[PDB]
Amino acid sequence: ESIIQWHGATNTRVPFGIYTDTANADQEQQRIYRGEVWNYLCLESEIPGAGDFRTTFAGETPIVVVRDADQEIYAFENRCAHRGALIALEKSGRTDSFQCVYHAWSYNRQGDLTGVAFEKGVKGQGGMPASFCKEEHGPRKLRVAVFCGLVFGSFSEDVPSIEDYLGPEICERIERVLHKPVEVIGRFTQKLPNNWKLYFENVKDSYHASLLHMFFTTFLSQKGGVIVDESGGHHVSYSMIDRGAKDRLKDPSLLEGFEEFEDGVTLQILSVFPGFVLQQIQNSIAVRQLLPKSISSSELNWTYLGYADDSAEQRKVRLKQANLIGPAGFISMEDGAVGGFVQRGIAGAANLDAVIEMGGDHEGSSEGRATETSVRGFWKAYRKHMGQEMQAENLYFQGHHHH
Amino acid sequence: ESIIQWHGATNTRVPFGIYTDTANADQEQQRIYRGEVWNYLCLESEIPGAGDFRTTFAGETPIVVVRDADQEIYAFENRCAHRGALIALEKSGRTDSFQCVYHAWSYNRQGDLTGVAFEKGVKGQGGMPASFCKEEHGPRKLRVAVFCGLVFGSFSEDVPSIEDYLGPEICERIERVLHKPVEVIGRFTQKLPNNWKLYFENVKDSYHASLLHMFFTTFELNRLSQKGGVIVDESGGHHVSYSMIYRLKDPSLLEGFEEFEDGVTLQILSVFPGFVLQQIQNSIAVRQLLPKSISSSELNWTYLGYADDSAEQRKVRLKQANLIGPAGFISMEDGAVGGFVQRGIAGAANLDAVIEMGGDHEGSSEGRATETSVRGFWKAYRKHMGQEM
Amino acid sequence: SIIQWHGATNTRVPFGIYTDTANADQEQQRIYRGEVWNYLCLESEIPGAGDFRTTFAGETPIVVVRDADQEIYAFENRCAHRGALIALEKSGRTDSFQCVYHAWSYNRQGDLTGVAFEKGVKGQGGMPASFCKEEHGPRKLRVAVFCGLVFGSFSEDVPSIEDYLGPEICERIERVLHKPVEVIGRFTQKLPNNWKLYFENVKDSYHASLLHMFFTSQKGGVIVDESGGHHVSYSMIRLKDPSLLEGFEEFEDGVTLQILSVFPGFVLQQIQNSIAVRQLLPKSISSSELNWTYLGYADDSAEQRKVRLKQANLIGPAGFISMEDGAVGGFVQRGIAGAANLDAVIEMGGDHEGSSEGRATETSVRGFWKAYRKHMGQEMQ
Amino acid sequence: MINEIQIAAFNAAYAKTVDSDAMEQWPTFFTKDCHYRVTNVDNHAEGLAAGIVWADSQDMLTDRISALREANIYERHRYRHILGLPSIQSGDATQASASTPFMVLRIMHTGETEVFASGEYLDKFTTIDGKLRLQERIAVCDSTVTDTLMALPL
Amino acid sequence: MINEIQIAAFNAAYAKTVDSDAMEQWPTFFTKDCHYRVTNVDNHAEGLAAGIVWADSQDMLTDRISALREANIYERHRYRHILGLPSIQSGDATQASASTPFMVLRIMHTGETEVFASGEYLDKFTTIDGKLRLQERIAVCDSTVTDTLMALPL
Amino acid sequence: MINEIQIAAFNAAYAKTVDSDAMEQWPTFFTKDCHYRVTNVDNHAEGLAAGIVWADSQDMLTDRISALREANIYERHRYRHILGLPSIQSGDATQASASTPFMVLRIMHTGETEVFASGEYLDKFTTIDGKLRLQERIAVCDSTVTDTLMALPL
Amino acid sequence: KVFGRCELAAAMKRHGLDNYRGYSLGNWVCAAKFESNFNTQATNRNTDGSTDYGILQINSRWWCNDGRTPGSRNLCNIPCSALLSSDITASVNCAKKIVSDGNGMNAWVAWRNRCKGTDVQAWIRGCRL
Numbered sequence A: 001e002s003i004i005q006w007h008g009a010t011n012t013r014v015p016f017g018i019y020t021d022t023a024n025a026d027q028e029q030q031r032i033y034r035g036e037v038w039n040y041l042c043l044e045s046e047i048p049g050a051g052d053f054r055t056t057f058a059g060e061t062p063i064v065v066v067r068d069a070d071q072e073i074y075a076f077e078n079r080c081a082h083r084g085a086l087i088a089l090e091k092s093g094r095t096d097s098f099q100c101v102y103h104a105w106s107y108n109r110q111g112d113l114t115g116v117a118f119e120k121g122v123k124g125q126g127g128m129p130a131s132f133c134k135e136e137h138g139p140r141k142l143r144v145a146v147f148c149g150l151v152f153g154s155f156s157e158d159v160p161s162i163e164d165y166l167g168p169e170i171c172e173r174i175e176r177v178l179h180k181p182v183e184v185i186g187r188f189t190q191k192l193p194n195n196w197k198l199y200f201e202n203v204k205d206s207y208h209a210s211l212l213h214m215f216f217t218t219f220l221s222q223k224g225g226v227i228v229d230e231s232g233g234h235h236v237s238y239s240m241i242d243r244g245a246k247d248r249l250k251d252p253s254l255l256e257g258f259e260e261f262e263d264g265v266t267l268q269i270l271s272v273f274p275g276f277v278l279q280q281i282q283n284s285i286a287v288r289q290l291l292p293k294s295i296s297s298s299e300l301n302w303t304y305l306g307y308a309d310d311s312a313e314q315r316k317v318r319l320k321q322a323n324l325i326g327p328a329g330f331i332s333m334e335d336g337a338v339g340g341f342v343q344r345g346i347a348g349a350a351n352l353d354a355v356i357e358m359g360g361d362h363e364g365s366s367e368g369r370a371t372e373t374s375v376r377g378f379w380k381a382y383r384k385h386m387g388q389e390m391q392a393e394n395l396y397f398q399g400h401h402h403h
Numbered sequence B: 001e002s003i004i005q006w007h008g009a010t011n012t013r014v015p016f017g018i019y020t021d022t023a024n025a026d027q028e029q030q031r032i033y034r035g036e037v038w039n040y041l042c043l044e045s046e047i048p049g050a051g052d053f054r055t056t057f058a059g060e061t062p063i064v065v066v067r068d069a070d071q072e073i074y075a076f077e078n079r080c081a082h083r084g085a086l087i088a089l090e091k092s093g094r095t096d097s098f099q100c101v102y103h104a105w106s107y108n109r110q111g112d113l114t115g116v117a118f119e120k121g122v123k124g125q126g127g128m129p130a131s132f133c134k135e136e137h138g139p140r141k142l143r144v145a146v147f148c149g150l151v152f153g154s155f156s157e158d159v160p161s162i163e164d165y166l167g168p169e170i171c172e173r174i175e176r177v178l179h180k181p182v183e184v185i186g187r188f189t190q191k192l193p194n195n196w197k198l199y200f201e202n203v204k205d206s207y208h209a210s211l212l213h214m215f216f217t218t219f220e221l222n223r224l225s226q227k228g229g230v231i232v233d234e235s236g237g238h239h240v241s242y243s244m245i246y247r248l249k250d251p252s253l254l255e256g257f258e259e260f261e262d263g264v265t266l267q268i269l270s271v272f273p274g275f276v277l278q279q280i281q282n283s284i285a286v287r288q289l290l291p292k293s294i295s296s297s298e299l300n301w302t303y304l305g306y307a308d309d310s311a312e313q314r315k316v317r318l319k320q321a322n323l324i325g326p327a328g329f330i331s332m333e334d335g336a337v338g339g340f341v342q343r344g345i346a347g348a349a350n351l352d353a354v355i356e357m358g359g360d361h362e363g364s365s366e367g368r369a370t371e372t373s374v375r376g377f378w379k380a381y382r383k384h385m386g387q388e389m
Numbered sequence C: 001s002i003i004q005w006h007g008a009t010n011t012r013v014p015f016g017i018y019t020d021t022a023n024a025d026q027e028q029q030r031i032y033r034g035e036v037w038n039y040l041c042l043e044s045e046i047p048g049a050g051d052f053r054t055t056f057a058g059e060t061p062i063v064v065v066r067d068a069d070q071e072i073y074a075f076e077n078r079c080a081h082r083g084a085l086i087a088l089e090k091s092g093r094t095d096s097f098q099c100v101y102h103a104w105s106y107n108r109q110g111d112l113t114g115v116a117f118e119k120g121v122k123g124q125g126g127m128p129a130s131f132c133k134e135e136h137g138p139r140k141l142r143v144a145v146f147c148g149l150v151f152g153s154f155s156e157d158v159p160s161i162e163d164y165l166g167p168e169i170c171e172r173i174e175r176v177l178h179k180p181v182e183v184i185g186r187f188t189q190k191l192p193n194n195w196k197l198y199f200e201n202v203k204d205s206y207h208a209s210l211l212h213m214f215f216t217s218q219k220g221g222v223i224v225d226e227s228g229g230h231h232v233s234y235s236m237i238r239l240k241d242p243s244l245l246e247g248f249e250e251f252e253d254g255v256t257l258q259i260l261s262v263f264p265g266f267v268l269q270q271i272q273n274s275i276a277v278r279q280l281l282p283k284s285i286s287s288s289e290l291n292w293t294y295l296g297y298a299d300d301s302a303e304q305r306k307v308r309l310k311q312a313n314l315i316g317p318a319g320f321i322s323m324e325d326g327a328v329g330g331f332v333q334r335g336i337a338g339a340a341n342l343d344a345v346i347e348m349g350g351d352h353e354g355s356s357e358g359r360a361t362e363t364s365v366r367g368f369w370k371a372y373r374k375h376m377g378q379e380m381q
Numbered sequence D, E, F: 001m002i003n004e005i006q007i008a009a010f011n012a013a014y015a016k017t018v019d020s021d022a023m024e025q026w027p028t029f030f031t032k033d034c035h036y037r038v039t040n041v042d043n044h045a046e047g048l049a050a051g052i053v054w055a056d057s058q059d060m061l062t063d064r065i066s067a068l069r070e071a072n073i074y075e076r077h078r079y080r081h082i083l084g085l086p087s088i089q090s091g092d093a094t095q096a097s098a099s100t101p102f103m104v105l106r107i108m109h110t111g112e113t114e115v116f117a118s119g120e121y122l123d124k125f126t127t128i129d130g131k132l133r134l135q136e137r138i139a140v141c142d143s144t145v146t147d148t149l150m151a152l153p154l
Numbered sequence G: 001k002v003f004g005r006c007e008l009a010a011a012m013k014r015h016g017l018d019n020y021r022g023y024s025l026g027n028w029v030c031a032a033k034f035e036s037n038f039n040t041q042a043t044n045r046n047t048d049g050s051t052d053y054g055i056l057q058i059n060s061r062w063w064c065n066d067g068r069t070p071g072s073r074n075l076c077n078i079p080c081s082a083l084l085s086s087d088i089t090a091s092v093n094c095a096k097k098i099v100s101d102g103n104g105m106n107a108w109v110a111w112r113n114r115c116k117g118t119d120v121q122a123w124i125r126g127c128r129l
C-alpha cells in the first residue's frame, strides 16, 4: 500500500514513491525545511546597507532577509500575523519598516509587530479588545548564521551551529572559494521538471559527473575524490592536478584560465543539505539555491560570482567560462533534464526501488568518483530528519532471534 | 493534526487549512452551494423574452436559467439525464426547447425530458425497455426566486423564501439601489488566484477599505471617521457596509450627481455565498463569485445604469467605472490581496487567522473599525458546514 | 464512495468512475499492467532489425523494437539503475539502447548488458562483488502480432492474442488488414476527458447518426466478443465537390463502414476507403491522448491513394464525422461536475452485453463496463 | 516583382477573414484548382501526404465551410493569428513560392486563451485579375498535437 | 494620407512605450479630446459602452499613469506586446480608421509568462502639426477574462 | 540609411535559420569580433555582465553549435520565433543601434507548446560588403526563468 | 500625381484593362480624362453625403469606405484613401469590380457623356504601348 517503504537500514535502495508521495512532501516541509536545517537565503554583499532586504523561500515558506542599522542580518517568515498576507511584495528593496498592504500592520526589520491600524478603534468604537497584545503576534523568526558571507536561516533554535552542521572539512572547502570579497555578476533561474530531491542527488552524483568529465577529455593527468560530512547531508566532489608532476575549439579562449588558488583543484562542487551548492569550475564561481515548488517541479537559482579585485581580463575569463554552467552550460545543460528523465521513467513504477550500490553501502569520504557514497549520504541525512530510519515493528521483525 | 480544526465556538480564529483542504471544498459543494442557500444566477432583464436563456454555475454545478411563455423564469442543472453531457453549450441564446447534441434527448424550458431519440427502436429493433419512463429521468430542477430583478436559484426544498433568507434590512438595502429598471452597460470577468472565501471575506472587510485603497482615503470617499455602519443579518451570511461624505488633472473621474434620498455615497451589500450589489457614488454593479479550484475563483461583473439615465448621467457612470472591475482604482487591489493571503500562508496550513477587531461580535455596528461582518460569514459558514464548536 | 456500482447489470454507471484518482491508479495496476493487450504500433512502422518506437501502455512508457530474428520485443522504458527513460526518441534504429544518465546499456530484449565503471576507475569504486547485471532490468512485455498489429502485455497469464480477441474480432480485423499497409500520416488529439469517455464513444452505435449530422436504405449491427471488451459496429447495402465521397470497391462483402475496438484502447476503422488505427492513452484523471495512424495499402495506385487522402476529411481532429468525437467526452466531464454521486443511464437494447442486429442499442457500451468490472474486481453477483 | 510586403498584406487579410469568422470568404483566397493541407513537421519531414484538412479544389474548401455552418457540433471559440514576415524562395510578377511563420491562439467563448498551433505556411502564389491568390497553402504545424478538435482552418 | 507604414511605425513606438515602463509618454500618443477603452468581443458585439479602462480626455490617461506610479497596490509585472499589421478600414484625404491585431504577454517579476490578452485595436487616426495621433483606440479583447487585475493599459 | 525594413528582413532570416535548426549558418549573421549574450531584464537593469550564453567572437558562436551537435544531451525540441517591428535608436548609412521585440515558443517532439522566452534584441548593426551584419546582439529576456534548459540560442 | 496621357495608358495596360469586360484601353484613358483630368488626388463631394475619389472618381456610398458616408456598402472592400494614391493599383482593382457589376462603364457619368461611342482609341495614339 505505502510507496515510501524503505527496504532496510541501508540506502542502496530508495523507494521511487519518495519522489511522488504528496503527504511525504508535506512532512518534508515540517521536518526538513522548518526543522533542524540551515536554509540558504542570500549573500551578505547582496544586502550591504541598513534597510536592504530580499525575499526568498525556505522550502515552501516565503522569507524576508534584511540588514539592520547594527549591520546584523535578520530573517523572518513573509506572513502577516493578521490574516496571513505576504508582507513584502518586492524581490528586493530598501526600507525602514515593513507594512502589510491589506490592513496596514507594521513590522520592524526583526519581524516584530510594531503597529496595528486602528488598534484602539475610532472615537470609542471597535478596535482590538483590551486582552490584545502586539508582542504576542508575529511571523516566525529565523535563527541566522553568516558563514564566509553566506546567509543561512533556520526555523529551529536547537539546530547545531553552522560550524558544527557543516563540519571542519566542508568549512575549509567553502573558505577556500569564498576567501576574499565576491561580486554578483549575474542571476538566472532554471525551472526543473522534477522533484527537488532528483536535482540535489544529481549535484551529489560523482558517478554521472565523472562519466561526463571523461567524455569531455575526448576534446593533464587528474585524480578525484568525494568528501561526505558525518550527517551524510553535505558533500564535496573534486578533481585536481599534482602541481610539479612531470609530463576541436575554434576559440580555445573558452577554456583558457589562470591560477588563483594555492592548490591543484580544477573542479570543486560542494552541497549543503537541503539545497545549497557552491561551485568552482576552473575560474567559474557560483552559488545555487534549490527550492521545492510542487511534487514534480523545483527551482534552481544561480548566483554567478567574480572577485571584487578581478582585473578586466580576469573578469572576462569568468564571463567566457560561464558558458560551461547554468541553463545553457556545456557541462550543466543536461543537469536540467536528467531529473525529468527519472520523474517520467518511474511513472508506472511508484512501488519499485532505485539501486544505489556504486562504492558499496558506504556513506563516507572516498578516493575516486566512481561511487554513489555522497548520494547515499543524502538519504542518510534525509531519513534522520524525516524519522524514516528502521524503528519499532520492522526493526523487531529483523532483530527477534538468538544466533 | 486536522488543518480545518476550529479552535473554539467564536470566530476570532479561522484555521488557514480551510483555504487549501480539498475534501472540505467538496463538502462546501454539497452543504453550501447545493444546500440551504440562494445562488445568484442573472438579472431578469438579461432574459427579457420567452425562450431567452443564459448558462452559469451554482458553485461547481453548471445551470441553465430561462424565461418561458408564462413570463416566469426557470432554472435546472445543465446535465443530460442520459450520460451526463452539458445540454446547453452557449453562454446565452433563445430557444423553444433544449436538445442534448450527443444522442438528441430533448428538454422543455423547465428541464423535463420531452424526447428520447429512437426510444421505440428503429424498424422494430433496439430502443428502451417497456419499463423505461421519460418522466423518471431529468436534471435536478432549482427553486427560482426573483427579488428586485435578481434571479436566485436553490437546490433545497427547505431553504426559506428569498425575502426571509435575506431578511428585512438586506431586502430594503437592495430595493434602495434596484428601485427602477436597470440596463447592463458591460460584462467583465476577473479570474482571482485565491480560494473563493478570501474574496468573499474581502467584500465583508470594512476594516481594510480605507487601508488597502489609497483612493478611498486620499480623496475622502470611504474613511473610517465618516458616518456609516456595518449591518450583519441574523444568520451572519449577509452584510452591508455604508458610508456618507497625489492630485488629478481631470477631476471629472470623481464628479457625480445626487440620486439617493439618504446621503449614502457608498453601499456594498453581500448575500451568502457569492452575491455582491455595489453602489460607489453613481457606479452601480452586481458581482457573482464562483469557486473554480481550491486556489482559484471567478468574479463576474455586471455593470449597470438605470434605463432612464440621460447621456450626461450615463457618461458619469462610464467614467466612475474606472474605480471598479479588473483595472479599478479600488478594485484592482481587491483582485490581488486574496492571492497575497493564499501565498502568505503557504507554510502555515496548521495556524489561524486573527479576527478580533470589534470583539467576538457577529452583529451590526456603528463605525467600520470592526471585523463583525467577516465573523458573520464564518458563523453562517460553520452552520451550513456542520462545523459549530 | 463515488465509484459504488448500483447492480450486477451495467444499465447504471457511477459518474465517480470518471473522477476518482485512487480508482485511476487501480486501472493502471489491474487494466494496463493486467490481463490485457495494449496496442503498441504497426509491423510496417518497425520493418527492419534495430527499428524501434517509444509509446505507452497506460501511464507506463514502453520501447518496442525489431531484432535480427525478425521478432518484435517490448520492455518498460525505465533504466534499472535510478529510473531514467532509456530511449528518448519517438523512433529510430539502433544496435543497443543506452541510458544517457550513467551509460547503462540494454540489448533489444531489455537485458542489462553493460554498466559504466562496473569494475571502478583505476581500481577504485565500482559495484560490489555481489552485483550481477542479469539480476537488474526493466520489466519485459509479452508481444503478440496480428495482421501487422503489435500488442504488448505485462501479464504472464493473459490469453493468446487470438483467444483474447475471439474469432469474430479476428475475422473482422483480417478483413481490413489482409495485405501490407503503409502509414500516410500521424496526428494526435489531446482529449479533455477521462480515457473511458472516448472509449465508450467509439463503442456508442446509438450516437453515430445523432451527434454526427453529416450524411443527414442499408442495414447494420453490433458485434460484442464474449468478454464484452471488444466490439464491431458495421453498416452495408448539396456538395459542390462530390469527389469527397467518391470511392472504389475493395472489400468482398458490401460493408461500407466497420469500426472495431479492442480493450482497453485500440480502434481499427474502415469508412469507405478511409482506413486508420487509433491508440487511446490515459494521461490524467480528466485528460487522454488519441493517436491516429492514417493508412493506405502498400499496393495502392496514385488514383486509389488520392481517394484515401480526400476521404480522410471525414476522420481525425477536423473530421466531418470525428470532429465532434473529440469534444463530446469533455461535455460529459463538465456536465457531471456536481454529480459525482449520480449514475449514467445505459438502457438502449435492454441490459444485454451481446451482439445485435441494428445499432439503436448500447450493448457494446455495457460490454465495455462488463470487461472493465471484471479486470477491476467491481462485479456484483 | 511580388514582394514580402504584398505577401504580408495578403496574409493579414487571410488571417482577418478566419479570425472574424467570415469563413464564407476563406475559399476566395485560393484558385479553383488549389491545394490546401494542414499537416505537421513529422509528416512533412517523412514525406507523408495526409492532412487533418486536405483539399485539391476551391469547392472542397466551400463544402468544408458549409459543413462547419450546418452540420458540425463544436464549442464556440475564435482564432487570433500572429504572422511573421514571409521569406520568398522564387517567383516573378505573377507567381511566388514563399514560407510564412504563424502562431494561432484559440480563445474559447468561456475565456481560456491557449497557443493552439504554430508553424509555417508553405505557399505557391499566382495572380488572378491583378490580385494575389493561393495556388497552394500547406500549413506545417510545429506540434503533432491538436487540443480537442480543429473546426476552423488555419 | 495616413498609410499602413506610418500606422505600423506608430504602433511599434506605442508598444515600446508601454512595454518599457515609460508609461508617462503613453498619453502623448493621443489627441487632447481622445477616447481610449479596454473592452471585449461580447460587449463590442452587443454595443455595450463600458470599459475596464474608459477615458474621454488625454488628462484621464495621465491620471491613470499617476495612480499606477504613486497610488495603486499590484504585484510587479511587465508586458510584451506582439502586434500584427494594421489594416485600414476607412479613410479620406486626412482621416483613417484601422484595425491592428495584438497579443500581450504578462511576465510577473517572479518569472511566470502568460498570454494575458489578445484582440484588435479599433483606431481612429489623425495627423496634427506633423504628428500621427489616436483620436480613438478601443482595445477589443478576444477574452471576457482578465487574470487577477489589469494595472498597465493595453 | 539602415532602415526598419532591412532590419525586419535580416531578423526574419535570423529566425528562419534558428527555427529550421540550420544552426551552422547562425554564426554568419555576426561580425568576426561580435558580442552575443542571452540575459534578462534584472541583470540588464543592474548592469550585470554575465550571460547564459556569452560570446565575444564568431568562433565562440561556431564552437557553441559544434557542442550542440557533438556534445550536448537534451530532449528533442524546436523554436518558433515571432518578432515585432524594430525601432532604430541611432545610426547612418553603415551603423545602427536598434531594438526588436521577440517571443520564442518551444515545441517538444512530444507536442507541448510553451512560451519559452520573450524580450527584445538590443542590437548594433554594421554593413560588411554592402550587407547587414550584427556587431552585437543582446537577447534581454523578460523573465529570469528558463524552463528545464536552453540548448538553442535565441 | 498628374499622369501624362500615354503614361496612364501604359499603366492601365500593364494592370490588364485593355478590353477588360469588352472595353478597349482608350475607353479607360478617356474615362480618367473627363472624371479626374488624370489627377490621382481628385475628390468631388456630392450633395447626398457621398464623395467620388481618385483618378476614376469612385463613389463612397457603393464602392469604398471613407468613414463619413451614411449607408456605405464598401463593395470593393477598401478605404477610399487607397484610391487617392499615386499608384493606380487599388483604383484599377476597384474599377474591374464596378465594370463587372452589370452596368459596364455606364457607372462613370463623365465617360457616358464625353467618351461612350466616340473614337476612344484617339486617347492612346502617339503612345508606346
Ligand SMILES: O=C(O)c1ccc(C(=O)O)c(O)c1
Binding pocket: A202, A203, A204, A205, A206, A207, A209, A210, A213, A237, A238, A267, A269, A279, A281, A331, A332, A335, A369
Ligand atoms: O565532478 C563532480 O562530481 C561534479 C558534480 C556535480 C556538478 C554540477 O555542476 O552539478 C559538477 O560540475 C561536477
Ligand SMILES: O=C(O)c1ccc(C(=O)O)c(O)c1
Binding pocket: B202, B203, B204, B205, B206, B207, B209, B222, B241, B242, B243, B268, B278, B280, B330, B331, B334, B368
Ligand atoms: O467600506 C467597505 O466596507 C467596502 C467593502 C468592500 C468594497 C468593495 O468594493 O468590494 C468597498 O468598495 C467598500
Ligand SMILES: O=C(O)c1ccc(C(=O)O)c(O)c1
Binding pocket: C201, C202, C203, C204, C205, C206, C208, C233, C234, C257, C259, C269, C271, C321, C322, C325, C359
Ligand atoms: O456507426 C458507429 O457505430 C460508429 C461508431 C464510432 C465511429 C468513430 O469513428 O469513432 C464511427 O465512425 C461509427
Ligand code: FES
Binding pocket: A080, A081, A082, A083, A084, A085, A100, A101, A102, A103, A104, A105
Ligand atoms: S493581513 Fe496584513 S494587516 Fe491584515
Ligand code: FES
Binding pocket: B080, B081, B082, B083, B084, B085, B100, B101, B102, B103, B104, B105
Ligand atoms: S448524453 Fe445527452 S442524449 Fe446522450
Ligand code: FES
Binding pocket: C079, C080, C081, C082, C083, C084, C099, C100, C101, C102, C103, C104
Ligand atoms: S539512471 Fe540509467 S544509467 Fe543511471
Ligand SMILES: [Fe+3]
Binding pocket: B202, B208, B209, B213, B330, B334
Ligand atoms: Fe475593498
Ligand SMILES: [Fe+3]
Binding pocket: C201, C208, C212, C321, C322, C325
Ligand atoms: Fe462517432
